[PDB]
Paper text:
2′,3′-cyclic nucleotide 3′-phosphodiesterase (CNPase) comprises 4% of total myelin protein in the central nervous system (CNS), being the most abundant CNS non-compact myelin protein4. CNPase consists of an N-terminal polynucleotide kinase-like domain10, a catalytic phosphodiesterase domain11, and a membrane-anchored C-terminal tail, which contains a cysteine residue that undergoes isoprenylation. The catalytic domain enables the rapid hydrolysis of nucleoside 2′,3′-cyclic phosphates to nucleoside 2′-phosphates. The CNPase catalytic site, lying in a groove between two lobes, has pseudo two-fold symmetry and contains two apposing His-X-Thr-X (X denotes a hydrophobic residue) motifs, characteristic for 2H phosphoesterases 113537.
Mutation of active-site histidine residues (H230Q, H230S, H309Q, H309S, and H230Q/H309Q double mutant) abolishes CNPase activity. Overall, the structures of H230S, H309S, H230Q, H309Q, and H230Q/H309Q are highly similar.
Residue numbers in the entry: 161 to 205, 213 to 337, 342 to 378
The structure:
């Protein structure tokens, strides 16, 4: 009998960090929903409460996934899990840097900017999203804050990749914690003046 892998590996925020980032996310959603520029462009996306719009919020603690394994059914799962760095890092505490919050018609999330140490724990898979073309490794790294009723949480990273592609290719408001950008097609990013730092434990989730 072989051993099951986790459902996924990743960085699981401490309860305090999780609560801090959730609160920040919610404040962002309330501020964006109330912003003139958002309300004006509501056609591409009475007023909309975005906390309600993103009705599926993650359970438990917030987390940033490295490798989704599906207990070993996902491509590259065993290959990822067998790495020394993964084993050595299992249970270890990290600090994650969050540089921006974003919204799309599908998801709400936080952009994680990995250290190169943390990048050692990022997977190197054969199948990459076409939206990840020409972006630095680990660009997909995110914390999902919410999504629409008919959307899967994994969409949040795809949405992030798409936003970063737009930013790579080359400002409608000033919020207290950063500058607000309208990227078109219902996409919005808050670029934080100060990166947000959260504490997290790298480990595996089985459910
Ligand atoms: Cl929480």
């Amino acid at each position: 009998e072989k051993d099951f892998l986790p459902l996924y590996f990743g960085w699981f925020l401490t309860k305090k960090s999780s609560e801090t980032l959730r609160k920040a996310g919610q404040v962002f959603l309330e501020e964006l929903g109330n912003h003139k520029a958002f309300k004006k462009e509501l056609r591409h996306f009475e007023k909309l409460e975005l906390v309600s719009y993103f009705g599926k919020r993650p359970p438990g603690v917030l987390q940033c996934t490295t490798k989704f394994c599906d207990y070993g059914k996902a491509a590259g799962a065993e290959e990822y899990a067998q790495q020394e760095v993964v084993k050595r890092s299992y249970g270890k505490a990290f600090k994650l840097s969050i540089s921006a919050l974003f919204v799309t018609p599908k998801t709400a999330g936080a952009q994680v900017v990995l250290t190169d140490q943390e990048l050692q724990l990022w997977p190197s898979d054969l199948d990459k999203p076409s939206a990840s073309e020409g972006l630095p490794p680990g660009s997909r790294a995110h914390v999902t804050l919410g999504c629409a009723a008919d959307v899967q949480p994994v969409q949040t990273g795809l949405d992030l990749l798409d936003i970063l592609q737009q930013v790579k290719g080359g400002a409608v408001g000033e919020l207290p914690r950063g500058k607000l950008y309208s990227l078109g097609k219902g996409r919005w990013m808050l670029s934080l003046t100060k990166k947000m730092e959260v504490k997290a434990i790298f480990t595996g989730y089985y459910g």
